[PDB]
Design a protein around this motif. Structure first.
Motif, PDB file in Angstrom:
ATOM      1  N   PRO A 259       7.346 -22.648   4.853  1.00  0.00           N
ATOM      2  CA  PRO A 259       8.550 -22.508   4.030  1.00  0.00           C
ATOM      3  C   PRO A 259       9.797 -22.305   4.873  1.00  0.00           C
ATOM      4  N   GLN A 260      10.919 -22.792   4.343  1.00  0.00           N
ATOM      5  CA  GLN A 260      12.231 -22.579   4.940  1.00  0.00           C
ATOM      6  C   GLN A 260      13.222 -21.995   3.942  1.00  0.00           C
ATOM      7  N   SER A 261      12.762 -21.614   2.752  1.00  0.00           N
ATOM      8  CA  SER A 261      13.630 -21.044   1.731  1.00  0.00           C
ATOM      9  C   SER A 261      12.793 -20.175   0.802  1.00  0.00           C
ATOM     10  N   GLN A 262      13.484 -19.308   0.057  1.00  0.00           N
ATOM     11  CA  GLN A 262      12.800 -18.415  -0.875  1.00  0.00           C
ATOM     12  C   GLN A 262      12.135 -19.191  -2.006  1.00  0.00           C
TER      13      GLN A 262
ATOM     14  N   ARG B  85       8.337  -9.943   0.441  1.00  0.00           N
ATOM     15  CA  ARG B  85       8.054 -10.733  -0.749  1.00  0.00           C
ATOM     16  C   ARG B  85       7.245  -9.893  -1.724  1.00  0.00           C
ATOM     17  N   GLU B  86       7.709  -9.828  -2.973  1.00  0.00           N
ATOM     18  CA  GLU B  86       7.006  -9.069  -3.997  1.00  0.00           C
ATOM     19  C   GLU B  86       5.681  -9.703  -4.396  1.00  0.00           C
ATOM     20  N   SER B  87       5.422 -10.948  -3.992  1.00  0.00           N
ATOM     21  CA  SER B  87       4.152 -11.589  -4.310  1.00  0.00           C
ATOM     22  C   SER B  87       3.023 -10.853  -3.603  1.00  0.00           C
ATOM     23  N   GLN B  88       2.236 -10.095  -4.366  1.00  0.00           N
ATOM     24  CA  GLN B  88       1.226  -9.200  -3.817  1.00  0.00           C
ATOM     25  C   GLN B  88      -0.180  -9.775  -3.941  1.00  0.00           C
ATOM     26  N   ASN B  89      -0.300 -11.091  -3.969  1.00  0.00           N
ATOM     27  CA  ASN B  89      -1.619 -11.705  -3.987  1.00  0.00           C
ATOM     28  C   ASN B  89      -2.271 -11.512  -2.624  1.00  0.00           C
TER      29      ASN B  89
ATOM     30  N   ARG C 127      -6.742   2.128 -18.528  1.00  0.00           N
ATOM     31  CA  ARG C 127      -7.000   3.449 -17.971  1.00  0.00           C
ATOM     32  C   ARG C 127      -7.335   3.392 -16.486  1.00  0.00           C
ATOM     33  N   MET C 128      -6.983   2.303 -15.811  1.00  0.00           N
ATOM     34  CA  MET C 128      -7.231   2.153 -14.385  1.00  0.00           C
ATOM     35  C   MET C 128      -5.914   2.135 -13.622  1.00  0.00           C
ATOM     36  N   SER C 129      -5.868   2.884 -12.525  1.00  0.00           N
ATOM     37  CA  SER C 129      -4.674   2.982 -11.698  1.00  0.00           C
ATOM     38  C   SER C 129      -4.619   1.921 -10.610  1.00  0.00           C
ATOM     39  N   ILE C 130      -5.505   0.923 -10.654  1.00  0.00           N
ATOM     40  CA  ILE C 130      -5.507  -0.113  -9.626  1.00  0.00           C
ATOM     41  C   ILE C 130      -4.169  -0.837  -9.608  1.00  0.00           C
ATOM     42  N   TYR C 131      -3.669  -1.204 -10.783  1.00  0.00           N
ATOM     43  CA  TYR C 131      -2.358  -1.841 -10.897  1.00  0.00           C
ATOM     44  C   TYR C 131      -1.251  -0.805 -11.061  1.00  0.00           C
ATOM     45  N   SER C 132      -1.224   0.177 -10.157  1.00  0.00           N
ATOM     46  CA  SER C 132      -0.222   1.236 -10.199  1.00  0.00           C
ATOM     47  C   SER C 132       0.309   1.548  -8.806  1.00  0.00           C
ATOM     48  N   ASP C 133       0.287   0.566  -7.910  1.00  0.00           N
ATOM     49  CA  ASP C 133       0.700   0.759  -6.529  1.00  0.00           C
ATOM     50  C   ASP C 133       2.207   0.660  -6.338  1.00  0.00           C
ATOM     51  N   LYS C 134       2.963   0.403  -7.405  1.00  0.00           N
ATOM     52  CA  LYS C 134       4.408   0.192  -7.372  1.00  0.00           C
ATOM     53  C   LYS C 134       4.802  -1.046  -6.575  1.00  0.00           C
ATOM     54  N   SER C 135       3.826  -1.807  -6.084  1.00  0.00           N
ATOM     55  CA  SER C 135       4.053  -3.091  -5.435  1.00  0.00           C
ATOM     56  C   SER C 135       3.437  -4.239  -6.217  1.00  0.00           C
ATOM     57  N   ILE C 136       2.156  -4.137  -6.553  1.00  0.00           N
ATOM     58  CA  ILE C 136       1.513  -5.070  -7.468  1.00  0.00           C
ATOM     59  C   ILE C 136       1.869  -4.654  -8.887  1.00  0.00           C
TER      60      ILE C 136
END
Lengths: 50, 52
Positions: free
Chosen positions: B6-9, B36-40, A24-33
């Motif tokens: 890095p030099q590659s994906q 990059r989709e890595s959102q850390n 029920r949390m929208s934190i993981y709803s950024d369409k990126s994460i």
């Protein structure tokens, strides 16, 4: 906020959608994460508009 | 902190995997603007060349 984080980390990077039944949390709803993640129930943020 | 060159994906993906395994601050360099989709948030990736 631990199980949803690992769940989104594993399947999200594989472009494997995951349906969140008990989220029920929208934190993981950024369409990126967690780009591959689905919400079975809306978060309380929607209820805010209520 | 860690430094990555890095030099590659695939290198970026492996670095992201190791970083998520560590969950620590790591710096990576991309020759251009790398979407990059890595959102850390713990990973800081810098585009070497700014957009023209």
């Amino acid at each position: 906020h631990f199980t949803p984080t690992p769940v989104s980390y594993t399947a999200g990077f594989y472009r494997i959608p995951v349906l969140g039944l008990t989220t029920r949390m929208s934190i993981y709803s950024d369409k990126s994460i967690h780009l591959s993640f689905l919400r079975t129930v809306p978060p309380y943020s929607h209820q805010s508009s209520v | 902190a860690l430094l990555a060159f890095p030099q590659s994906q695939g290198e970026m993906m492996e670095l992201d995997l190791v970083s998520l395994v560590l969950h620590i601050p790591v710096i990576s360099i991309v020759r251009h603007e790398f979407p990059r989709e890595s959102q850390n948030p713990l990973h800081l990736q810098l585009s070497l060349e700014n957009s023209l």
